[PDB]
Structures are given as structure tokens and as C-alpha cells.
Design a protein around this ligand. Sequence first.
Ligand SMILES: Cc1cc(CCCCCCCOc2ccc(C3=N[C@@H](C)CO3)cc2)on1
Lengths: 236, 236, 59, 255, 40, 40, 273
Amino acid sequence: GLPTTTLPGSGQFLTTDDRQSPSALPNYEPTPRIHIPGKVHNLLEIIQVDTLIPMNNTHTKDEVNSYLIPLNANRQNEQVFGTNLFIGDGVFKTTLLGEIVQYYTHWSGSLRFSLMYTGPALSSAKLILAYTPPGARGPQDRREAMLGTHVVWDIGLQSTIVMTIPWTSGVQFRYTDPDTYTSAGFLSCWYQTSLILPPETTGQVYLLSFISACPDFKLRLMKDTQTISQTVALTE
Amino acid sequence: GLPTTTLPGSGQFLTTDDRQSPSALPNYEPTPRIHIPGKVHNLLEIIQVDTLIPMNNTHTKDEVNSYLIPLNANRQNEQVFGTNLFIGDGVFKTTLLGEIVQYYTHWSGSLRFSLMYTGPALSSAKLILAYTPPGARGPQDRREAMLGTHVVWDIGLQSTIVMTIPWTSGVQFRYTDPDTYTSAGFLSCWYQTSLILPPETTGQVYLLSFISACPDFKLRLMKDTQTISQTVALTE
Amino acid sequence: GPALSSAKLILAYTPPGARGPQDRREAMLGTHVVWDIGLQSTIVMTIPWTSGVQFRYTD
Amino acid sequence: GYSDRVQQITLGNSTITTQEAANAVVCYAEWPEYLPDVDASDVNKTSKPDTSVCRFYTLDSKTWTTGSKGWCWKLPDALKDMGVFGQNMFFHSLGRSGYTVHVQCNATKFHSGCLLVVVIPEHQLASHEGGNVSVKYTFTHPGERGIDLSSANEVGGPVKDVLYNMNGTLLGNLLIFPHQFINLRTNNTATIVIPYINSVPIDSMTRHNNVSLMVIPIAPLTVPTGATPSLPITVTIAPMCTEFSGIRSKSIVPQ
Amino acid sequence: INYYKDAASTSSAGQSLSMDPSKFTEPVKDLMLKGAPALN
Amino acid sequence: INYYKDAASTSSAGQSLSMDPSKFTEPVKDLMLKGAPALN
Amino acid sequence: TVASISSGPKHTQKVPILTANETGATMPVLPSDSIETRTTYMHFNGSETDVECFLGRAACVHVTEIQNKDATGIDNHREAKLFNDWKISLSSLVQLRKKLELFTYVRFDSEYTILATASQPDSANYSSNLVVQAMYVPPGAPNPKEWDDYTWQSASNPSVFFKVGDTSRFSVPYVGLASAYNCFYDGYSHDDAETQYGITVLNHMGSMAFRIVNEHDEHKTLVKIRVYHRAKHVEAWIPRAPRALPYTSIGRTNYPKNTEPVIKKRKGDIKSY
Ligand SMILES: Cc1cc(CCCCCCCOc2ccc(C3=N[C@@H](C)CO3)cc2)on1
């Protein structure tokens, strides 16, 4: 008989501990694995695939239309859309990125925001996208917007433009859940010159917008998502 | 005194765990082993010996007669017997194979079904045995039956015919207990030409049928058999 | 057609033994090419020699 | 002078040419291949009809109009009646296949509109009834007709609400599945190569569909002035590396 | 590691991995070859 | 040290440290180079 | 590892930021393709986002309850909770369910922890000490009819006996029939016109039965069982869109009617911040 002493914590059950256990089914042989395409190893692998952002959130019931950012022909100087960058809330929240970020407490890294244009091929347009780093207000006019991170996008044969929100930060991690101290800025978009439709054409054209994370990205300290809950256990 | 921590599960008794225990009889010397023919090591060794199937289940009290499949002289085109292949139930259930399969939850592998003919030596017959893989109904006539796994059996000097139900399956294991998704097919038998008795002879002739497992076979995840129960403890 | 128009046609060869196809579904089950009208103005379909007998009469 | 743009796919006795492609997607970066022995379970030798089943079948055409919500086809169902592919299907106990899907929609440089073409492995649909109402067989086996998401709820059928992918997930995130867009201004076809994806090496072709192909208008169709307000969309699909096993009597399926 | 002195006190045995059904499936005196006739 | 015989009884696995998003982010048939035109 | 390299002004014919999303790719664009950057290192590995880590902590998967009371004159033990039973499943409760359904096929060993606590809602002199016995009743094996049937002998079926207030823990290998468990299944068990659709037909795992071994004392004792499940040795294939609407049933994808908009409406314009 070897002398032992038990410490504080004996008998506790910590849902996060990782130890060995007896197998209830001694000697059982599991089914062989066969090959299946698509294996995922890290959630970091999947948040780099871009998905659509319901940017046009202004509706009243969920609709395919809140994915469409409208553009008006012949407007000059004006603003196309605006949003803050709380990736865990608001427009971002239902996107795959938003949806995964919510399983973690802290995030750090660059984001990739792209816009794909869908107007007739014989039209043309020049837009400016601007990222405003924390510390200033959402820009109120392009002059204000153009003094921060921006890209003049020229609509052409190449249909999409990929803007990166480079990680601009004092503190090396921000909370996913809306924190002030930890806030990331604003994203706005304005006409640089203006949309022009060809003859025989009319109305609004739309941009689709996507979001995905750069390879830069870090997420840490897992927790429970506000995105799902329940009141009684389900049954069959 | 070495510091320890006890984990969740301490003090539990799991009937399936395998550990050391103090011997109550320290130093006792067991009787020497002598040699005995017949040692069994695996249940897989014994389910390869074939045993008779009470195929003729149509009686009302258990009788030697439900082991006998009758054959009629001069019938043409017609059907000799039919059964599904739920090896854990129905005809199969009391056979040694059926009886062991019931100690496990899953089975996979090929089955060997053979028929031994017992009619007078001066008679003759040609039968077709057909295996119908999952997905179609039990065949309704030989034409239907002959399009799946089948063997034309010619009754001769060699008294038995061994049909194999080759493992035909998407999923690599099936439950013993009747599952649909997991179902294995049907087995039917029809006259290929017809039984013919010699002169001075009359009546029905019978086939005996056996079942055993091919060396192919796998059984896993042990459990309790529905084949035995009790209401009070027995006594001497 | 005008350069600013567009079209997609299917050409189908039906080997001997069946009737002239009566609808595209029927037609598309034999030798066929989906032609996409583009910059490249012509499409070349080949009727590959499908035959039991190695010669046919012209007449 | 090769462009990403022009392409030719020849499979069997049938060929497709596109002069306005946008590359092609190969699901999960894997190309269809036959079933290796190391992965095999059923002991039966399989049948590989090759060129008689691995050719292009063009399903009947759809009509995109300003009110369209989107269409959904299931595989191998959509092909259950195409030539010898279909016969093989009803006649063997098990079968396995990959596909090349080519979705076609051409317009002019004055039209606008953008379709999402996506392949969803194991797309289990939801009942519009809620609770635990099931979706009857016939409803998930529309055949070449596919399911029309702008048709009405029916009884025993699935829900046809587009912002929810017919299953409780948002349209916006379908982009995690192999997919390609058809943006009239760019593109005129979409091509996706689908490798066989299952948790078993071979399965039944009638009780289980392993992918739904979905074409969904996202930026509404907008035709030039006084143009007819609609465009046809055509779907052509070719089984590739098909194998059938466990031949017999010929399945009888509901309805 | 056995902590105890007696053999009965050790854990379960380990798989025979013996397996030879022929004493049960083919106890015939003259050897039968599959493919050759059963009765000559 | 495993104290138990079966593999299911061992603790959690250890980090894939595999990580290859290209099956998801770039499943295109003809390779796209960043910087070169998307459609040629 | 560098998180960003140093990059300066650019005036090229080589534009990495113009792409064609119609292709289905997400081109790997970085901050340094469009602004001037400085070197910085990652200092991070992505350890805690590994799927083994993501699915590897215990989650509550089931809460049931049984009572110890005099069975004298009870015609239906099962019905008196003289011994409840549970149809093993991993989707009855939703926190873990949404996590698993981020994948289509999943393969793992399970580690179960079972906590049992007792309650004595009405006047008792004391708290008794009860031993619970949880049995694994896979499909095809006799299922218990009374709280003290021959079934409980469990001569071939793994069972664990632990005390109320304590915890029991053991681990079961991956018992799936196929190579992975289907998180989704767009099929039927056969081509029947009315058979159920979904996976209900596929995760035929069987049930698990709990009972108190103790006979009855003078008062009644409520024992409530909580089953926790931890995946170990995880393997996951084919990512899918996360669950947006609420769940209604074990094993079907169905969402409730007149559900509410899941995308938050702006308080303001598209232009709003
Ligand atoms: C005593 C005692 C009690 C037991 C129980 C043995 C464990 C058997 C359960 C096997 C694992 O069960 C499932 C069920 C469903 C799923 C699953 N469903 C999908 C959503 C995903 O995974 C996985 C495992 O063992 N010994």
C-alpha cells in the first residue's frame, strides 16, 4: 500500500478536462474509415471562404433583398452604404464569419470585404470604399471618408473588388461581442464618379457584398453563442 | 505521502471493466489441466458449422416436420419455399447461427445456405435457388427470381448443394434485430424443370436445409439475447 | 446574327435504328454538341461513322 | 489564346462548348474516381457501363422571370429516367456516381441578373408544417422536373422558402458549398464537377439522394427596355465514373 | 504491472487469436478437397 | 501512459496542425494566380 | 511566422485586388496587397479552433428522472418513473447540436459523464443513499419491463452502478454502422411511400436505461439524471451553413412556422453607422 494525500478539487467534474476512461465496450472493432472529400481540421480553415452579407438590412422580414445593395444612375458625390465593424453583431452577425466569431471571446486579424457588381455589361461606375480606423466618427461625406484606408474601384471586366480592413489596433485582441474600448472602425462606400447605364436600360443595379477573414486572423477563448437557445428538450 | 486528485467515475462499478483484485485464497494451487478434445476459442469458430433450419414453420406446435421442406412430383415452373433474410428472427432464429447472432448487435459477411436432397435414388429434379439483394420485393415467379443471385441445382449422386448469399450491401454492417434500412434481401427456390419419381414410388420427398456463416463473417457489440428470460431465481 | 445577340443551340446526330427525334429530349440522347454562339462564329459537328456494314450505297 | 472563358467538355458521345465560362469548380478539390478495393465492402464485381451512362443529359428547360424564387434538383433522381443511366439505376441494388453539372443562361450586354449555382451534399429538406412532420418520398423525388421554390406549399412536401435553403439555414451562407455564380454581365454558364460524397462506399440510388443542385436568382433579372421579361435557364448533367452493383429484379418505387 | 502475488488476481486474458474451426467443421477421417467430388 | 487497453479510452487527440483551406477557398479547375487577371 | 510582411508603394499592371467572384474562389488577398505594411509576427497557432478542441468538451445532452418509491400496486413501472429510459441521441438539446451540424459527417469516440442528484420535495426524516444502475440496452436486446426484471441482470450488456450525488464516467468507441455518423441524410430507409424522412432511421443507436437499485424507504426520493457527452478523437467532413432558425424536432431540419426575422433590421438607413 503506497501512501497518498488527496488535494482540493478531488471528485470534481470539469467539462473541459481531458483524461482516460474505461471503455464500456471492451474489444469492439469500429467500422473501417473510407475516404470522404471535404475534411475540416480547423474552424480557421472555413472562415476564409467568403459568404454574402445582408448589408441592406432595412427590410422588415428576412428577404433575398437585404443581400442587395442598390446603386442609382447619375448620382455624384453621394454615399452608397455605411456600417460599423462589430463583426459579432448587426450585418455581420448571420454570416459564416459572424457566426463562428460568436463561438469565441476574442478575435484579432485582417478582414477581407469584397463587392461583386451585377449591372449590365455596357454600364460603368467608379466607387470608393473607405475603412475608418477607431477614433473618428463614421465619415459623413467622401472628403472625410477618403482620408482613411480606401480603394477607388473601377467597374470593369473584372467583376469583384477585394478590400482588406488591415488590422489597425493598439490592443492586440478585440472582443467579438460589442466592446467600446475594443471597437474597430467603420466601413463606408461613395460614388467616386457615378454609375452610368447604357441606352435602353433602366432602374437600379445592385452590388453583392461578401466577408471572409484573412490568413492573419486569430480567434480565442471559446464560449457559448447567443445565436441559439431553447425552452424544452426536443423529442423525436 | 504523494499528492493525488480523484476524477469523476471514482468508486463506480462498470460490469465491463478489467482490473486486478486481491485473491481471497492466497497461495492455493489449482488442479492441473489434462487434455480434453474440443476446445473453443472464438464464437466465430462455431458459427461455421452448419445446422438445420426449421424452414417449414407452418406447423402449430414445434415438430420434426418443420425441418422438412416438401417437394411435389411433376409440378413445373412453381415455387418451393420463400423467406426473408432477417437472420435474427423467423426461421433463422433458433438455429445456432441465429442463436449466436443474437448475442451481438451488428453482423456483416457471407452466409452459406445448403439443401440436402432425400428422395429415392432413382428420382431426379432440377431446382433453382435465388438470392434477391435488398431493394426489390420477394420474387413472385422464377422469371423474377432468376434475374438475381441464383444456382441451378441438378439433383444427383452428390446430395447437397451449397448456395452462398454473398455480402451485398451499401453500409458495412447490418443489425441482427430486424432493421429496414439495414435489411438483407430474400431467398426463394422454384422448380427449374420438376421432380420426377421412379415407378412404384409415391408421394412427397423432402429437402433438409442448413445455415452456417462464411469465413467472411463479422459480429460485434455484444448484448443480451431476447431468447431467454425468467421471473424468479431458480433453486436446487 | 448581330454581334450583340447570343444563343445556345444543340445539334444531334441520331444513328440508324431510331426515328428522327421528335423533341430535344429524344434528340439529346444521341451524338450531340451544345453550341454556344460567340466570338468564334462557326461550330463543326462531326457525324462519326456509326455502322454495322462497312459501306453504305450513295443512292 | 486559351481563356478561362472558352471550354469544351466531351464525355461519351456528347460535347458541350462554352465561349463565356468563369473557370469551373471541382467540389472539395477532388475529381470523381472509381471505388478502390481498400474501401470496398460488398463482394460483388461492379458493372461500369462507361460511355453509355457517362454522357450529358439535358433536363427540360426552366424560365427565369422577375418573379422566380429558384429551383432545386436532387441527384441521382433528376436522371432516374435518362437513357441507360436510369435503367441501370432501377435494376441494381447499389450504384455510385460523380457528375459534371453545366448550367446555361445567356442574355445580352443590356441585361442584368445573377444566379447562384450550388451543390449541397446531403440536403435534408424541412417540412413546412414544423414540428416533426416528415417530407414524403414523392416530394423529395421530383425527377427531371425538380422542385420549384415559387410553387405553393403542398401536403407532405418540403417548405420552399428561399432565405432559408429549405432547411433552417440562411441563403447568404450557401457559399460555404461548392458553387459558382452566373452574372449576365460576366458569365453565361456555371460548371461544377462532383466527386461521390457519402459515409458508405456505395449506396442505394433510389432511397437516398446525395446532392441537391440548386439554381437561385439573387440579383433579379432586369431586361432592357421593351425586351421580353424572361430568359430560359437549361441544366445539362453527365454521370461520370458510374458503377452499379447487385443486379436483380428491378426496383418498384412509390408513385 | 501486477500488484498482487497470485495469478488469479490478474486481469482478463488477451485474445486467443487461435481460431481453427476444422475440429468442428471438418472432423472427417479421409480429407475432403473442395471441388473434388464428395463421394468417389 | 495509457492505463487502459482500448483506444477509445485514451484522452483527446492533439492538434491536427493540418490546415489547408484551399479545398474550400479555391476549388477551381484551372488555377488562378493572384495578380493575374481573373478572366482572360 | 510572419502575420504581415513589409510592403511599400506599388504602381503596377499586376492588380491582385480585382477578381471575378463568379468563379467560386475566395482569392487569398492580404493587407499588404492594398496598403503599405510593416512586418509583424503571428505569435499564435490556432490551437483552440482545432475541431478536436471545438467538439471536445463535455456538453449536457440529456436530463431524465426516476424515483425510488414503493412499487406495490404499480401497474406500469415505466410509467411511474420507477425506471426511466432514454433513446440515446445527441440532438435533443441544442447547444451541442448546432456545433455538430456545422459538419455533414462526424466520427468520434464518446466519453459520457452521468451526474445524479436527489431531491426530497416532501417531508423526509433523512436523505437515503441510493445507488443508480444505468444499462446499455442496444436494439435487439430485451428491454426492461419492471424496475427489477431479469433484464437488469445485464449479463452481456455493459452496465455501471454509481451512487446518487456522485458521477459515473466511461467511454464508448464510435459505434456507428457506416464510416461516419450522418449529421444529415436526404434519404429514407426504403422506397416506401409513407416511410419517415431524415436520419431518425439511420442513428439507430438504441436506448439507455436507468433505475435505482435500492428498495423503498418510508419517504419518496426523486433522482434526476444528467448525461454529459464529450467527443474524443474527432474527424469531421464537409462544412455547411450554420443553423439560423430554431429547432422543432430530433432529427429533422424543420423550423417553426411564423418564426421571427433572424437578420436584425437596421435602426436607420443602409447608410447608417
Ligand atoms: C453503462 C453504459 C451505458 C452505455 C452507453 C453506450 C454508448 C452508446 C451511444 C453511442 C453514441 O451515440 C450517438 C448517437 C447519435 C450521434 C450523432 N447524431 C448526430 C447529430 C451526430 O452524432 C452520435 C452518437 O455504455 N455503457
